[model samples]
Target: GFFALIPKIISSPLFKTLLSAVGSALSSSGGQE
Candidate 1:
């Protein structure tokens, strides 16, 4: 077991929620505007 923080960083909740927000925004909204 070594350098585990890297995975934790990418799997972090902040990024998770951010992606969820972005996914919903892109799906619900439009980029053509």
Candidate 2:
């Protein structure tokens, strides 16, 4: 089930890091604005 998606998520390190950066940026902005 949900656990099955973990491998695919970890497989793309670059994309994952990029997404994390963008996600954190979005979340941070959400707090101030």
Candidate 3:
């Protein structure tokens, strides 16, 4: 079951921004050995 706070965190702009930034940063650097 999903926790109630997960929905709130997922819906927040701060959370979204952090996730987006991490995803973008990781994507660019993920292929290096």
Per-residue lDDT tens digits for candidate 2, residues 1-33, read 257876567647656676777677776656655
- Angstrom error at residue 30, model 1: 1.8
lDDT of 1 by residue, 1-33 (tens): 248777567756666777787777776566534
Runs with alpha carbons beyond 4 Å of true place in candidate 2 = 1-11, 30-33
Taking all chains together, the TM-score of candidate 2 against the true structure is 0.42
| C-alpha lDDT of residue 14 in model 3 | 66
Local error of candidate 3 at 1, Å? 28
Q: How high is each candidate's TM-score?
A: 0.43, 0.42, 0.39
List pairs with backbone clashes in candidate 1.
Answer: none
Please give the lDDT score at residue 23 for candidate 2: 73
Descending-TM-score candidate ranking: 1, 2, 3
lDDT of 3 by residue, 1-33 (tens): 177776666657566776777676676557443
Question: Against the unseen true structure, what C-alpha lDDT does each candidate score?
Answer: 0.67, 0.67, 0.65
